[PDB]
Amino acid sequence: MYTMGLDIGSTASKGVILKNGEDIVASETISSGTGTTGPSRVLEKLYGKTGLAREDIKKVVVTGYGRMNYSDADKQISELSCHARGVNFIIPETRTIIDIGGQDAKVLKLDNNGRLLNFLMNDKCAAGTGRFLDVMAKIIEVDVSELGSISMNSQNEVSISSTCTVFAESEVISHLSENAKIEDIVAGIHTSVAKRVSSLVKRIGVQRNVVMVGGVARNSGIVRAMAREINTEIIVPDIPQLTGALGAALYAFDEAKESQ
Amino acid sequence: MYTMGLDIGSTASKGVILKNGEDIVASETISSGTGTTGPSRVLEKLYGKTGLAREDIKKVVVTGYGRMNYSDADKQISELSCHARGVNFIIPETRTIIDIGGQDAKVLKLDNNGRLLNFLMNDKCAAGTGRFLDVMAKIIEVDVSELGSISMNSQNEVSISSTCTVFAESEVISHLSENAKIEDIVAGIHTSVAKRVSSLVKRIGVQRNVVMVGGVARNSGIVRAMAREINTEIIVPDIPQLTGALGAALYAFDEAKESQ
């Protein structure tokens, strides 16, 4: 009936209280992490605006970098598991999450309940990840966040052959030398990364709803390319900081249920 | 009994006359290619120092970029096939060739006769190739050919984790920043490429004699690393320009044999 979720970074602490797995009754965030007052201060804020007693919280689950440091807790669950679980709380019927990171990319398949089932990670190749985008940006002397908008007014599209990052880093200088329209080039870089991650998506199997996450997911152009490529509408929602603790309160709630 | 082999680049022309598939009776090279006098001038030189007549040459085989341009020829065979065939003529009992190129790497398996059987190419990834070496060199501000010798006096060995070129390009700047001994770092870069190509070698199957070819093969340090890694003595011979035509004269000779 009343469960708690804690997420303890190294730089921040976050917590959620959740009635009947349906109602966030309180939430808090503090800019202090593992080994500080931060997590204590989250609890005060939660217990104080609710008026509840420790006996009222049936289960606590904690996640985050410092989750192994924290004792008064019924369970420790991964941030990957937890975080996703919260994302589905935000967009129900989510079954496929796409996290293009700065140095990695992961596709996650989920339960009818929003619980991680299996997933694929790329951490070894620079292509089809964030850094692929740093590189190309530096070459045409532009800022990475300025990128998604340039690509809007594409008229043709610079098609690339190179799949490797290095090779490609030449191939755009060759298109640059000729002096093609940047909205054509940026459209063909986006297509690169899109084609890459698409393969991971292909292997794991699409199944809507399909949500996109990460810093890279704000690049509107990457999102379109990705959509066109997997052939499915893609949701890019706004995910709040307290999404990890949220997922934890949810797991802390499957758990309260099983005691009975 | 007397066969001829022609190799016609875009910048050069080369030819060989070969008695009984055993004796190079004459050879010539001219710095002019496809669409010039070059190939005519090779023939004169061959026919003139031999004193032979066109009737005496039983079969001609031609290979090279411009092999499709040349008519008076019994056959056209690939340069890959031909070139290897000659290398075995230089190092008998060769069964495994390793060509680390500037932008690619290939491992070739050969016949008991020195005839290509099957092979594996990497052309898509920058790691485990020439360019992997350009990159790292630029970073520590050194010339690529100066490389193999630095690595001789290695005392420890900078171990790398990154397999991707980009990722690694950071990882050496991190070892550089700390200021480790270059002979340790260069020893761990060599180990990178070595580990890469080793996989291709592993997949295709080692079988001596094992010969190493390419510009990259002069880097003595790469050769050691490669040896240690595949666990087999490696021959780095000196391969003359007229190796392609040589292999062609050899194929032109399996061919003379079959008419009878």
Is residue A3 located within the same domain as residue A87? yes
- Residue numbers after which chain A is interrupted (C to N above 2.5 A) read none
**Phi, psi (rounded to 5 degrees) for B71:** -95, -60
Q: How far apart are CA B51 and CA A200, in angstroms?
A: 66
- A253: part of which helix (H) or strand (E)? helix A243-259
Is residue A157 located within the same domain as residue A66? no
Q: Which of A162, A164, A171 to mutate to test the interface with B (most CBs of B within 10 A)?
A: A164
Is residue A165 located within the same domain as residue A253? no
Beta-carbon contacts of residue A126 (< 8 Å; ≥ 6 apart): A103, A132, A135, A165, B164, B165, B166, B167
Cβ atoms of residues B239 and B85 within 8 Å: no
Is residue A108 located within the same domain as residue A219? yes
Find how far residue B99's CA is from the centre of its chain: 5
> Which residues from chain B sit within 8 angstroms of residue A126, using beta carbons?
164-167
Degrees (nearest 5) of the Cα angle A172, A176, A181?
Answer: 105
Enter the tokens of residue B220. Answer: 């003595």
Partners of B59 in beta bridges: none
Residue in chain B lying closest to A125 (CA): B164
Exposure b/e, B191-206, CB count within 10 A at least 16 = b? bbbbbbbbebbeebee
Enter the tokens of residue A2. Answer: 């009343």
Is residue A59 located within the same domain as residue A132? no
Is residue A100 located within the same domain as residue A134? yes
Is residue B111 located within the same domain as residue B231? yes
Residue in chain A lying closest to B164 (CA): A125
Report the amino acid identity of residue A96.
Answer: T
Torsional sign, CA A172, A175, A177, A182: negative
Taking residue B69's Cβ as centre, other Cβ atoms within 10 Å add up to 13
Sheet holding A96-100, edge to edge: A116-122, A105-110, A96-100, A210-213
Torsion angle of the four alpha carbons A227, A230, A236, A241, in this order, in degrees rounded to the nearest 10:
-150
Structural domain span for residue A180: 95-235
Report the amino acid identity of residue B102.
Answer: G
Is residue A229 located within the same domain as residue A248? no
- Contacting A with CB below 8 Å, chain B residues are 103, 124-126, 131, 135, 163-167
Report the binding-site residues of A: 10-14, 102-104, 125, 134, 164, 215, 241
Residue B29: Cβ-neighbour burial (10 angstroms; 0-12, 13-18, 19+)? middle
Residue A245, CA distances (Å) to A18, A181, B101, B167, B246 in order = 10, 45, 52, 32, 72
**Phi, psi (rounded to 5 degrees) for A53:** -115, 155
Resolution (A): 3.0
Is residue A113 located within the same domain as residue A151? yes
Is residue B142 located within the same domain as residue B218? yes
- Contacting B with CB below 8 Å, chain A residues are 103, 124-126, 131, 135, 163-167
Is the peptide bond between B231 and the residue preceding it cis, with omega within 30 degrees of 0? no
What is the secondary structure of B156-203 as a DSSP string? S-------SHHHHHHHHHHHHHHT--HHHHHHHHHHHHHHHHHHHHHH
Separation in Å, CA of A200 to nearest CA in chain B:
18
Residue A155, CA distances (Å) to A147, A171, A185 in order = 16, 20, 10
Is residue B102 located within the same domain as residue B197? yes
Separation in Å, CA of B145 to nearest CA in chain A:
21
Enter the tokens of residue B228. Answer: 């240690």
Q: How far apart are CA B245 and CA B30, in angstroms?
A: 13
Is residue A211 located within the same domain as residue A84? no
Residue B259's domain is classified under what CATH number? Answer: 3.30.420.40
DSSP annotation of B120 reads E
Give how many domains chain A has, as a whole number. 2
Q: How far apart are CA A83 and CA A101, in angstroms?
A: 15
Separation in Å, CA of B72 to nearest CA in chain A:
38
